[PDB]
Design a protein around this ligand. Sequence first.
Ligand SMILES: [Mg+2]
Ligand SMILES: [Mg+2]
Lengths: 146, 146
Amino acid sequence: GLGPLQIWQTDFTLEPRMAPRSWLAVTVDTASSAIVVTQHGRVTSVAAQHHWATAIAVLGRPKAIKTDNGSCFTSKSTREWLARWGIAHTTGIPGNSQGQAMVERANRLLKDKIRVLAEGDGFMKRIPTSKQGELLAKAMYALNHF
Amino acid sequence: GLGPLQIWQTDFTLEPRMAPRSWLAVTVDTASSAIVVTQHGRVTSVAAQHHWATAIAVLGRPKAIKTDNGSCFTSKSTREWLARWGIAHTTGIPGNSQGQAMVERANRLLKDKIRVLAEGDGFMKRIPTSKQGELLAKAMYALNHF
Ligand SMILES: [Mg+2]
Ligand SMILES: [Mg+2]
């Protein structure tokens, strides 16, 4: 009612411990601080849309999504996908310098958690491909659920 | 406090429109009625554990999970995975006849929704492999978010 606006922040961050699908797409729901992360082999417009399809299934449809000016986010294809869903998109002030410190902070907490969990299982370098999915799901659980 | 107990019901259901990964793993959180669905190529113990890793990331860790006596759920491997997480597992009364009508109902609502969404996009038979992920995420959004 007087509750926070439903605005998300989304960004891509590279994590070589998760190669070959080392591009992690991370969305922070600013109203709840919930985080959703998915893994991708390449940063393309389609990877961003696949990420947000997953995020909408888990968090519901937001009123707006804030991103940086990465081309996977400002292409015609991504713009039409967001219009199809009725979601407003902003890159904020053109040289906002900040504006998405929340997702930036999530990126760092996420990578730290993947490293500590991986090293706890004995993987000091790249995580074996077959173990990556449960390890990413474990890091996401750890940052969301208390 | 006096709130519902955190108990999930999980089951596998076959959906050929989603081949080759036509086995859908579905978990209903009975306290909230939220549903989580994932797709798999084969029904094995590991598919069930991958499903619940995803469900825990999205819903939190439950106190118990109720399933039928399917072998992917009662194997030594699945039993040890659930013990590693500290989750109690029950198959309910041995010949409960029911006991998981909630997940049974979710299975049917899910398959109906996949069919209506698929036919809305012009896929009357199997959904093209590259479109399945967003279509499953759309069906999950539709059954959870209002
Ligand atoms: Mg970026
Ligand atoms: Mg069954």
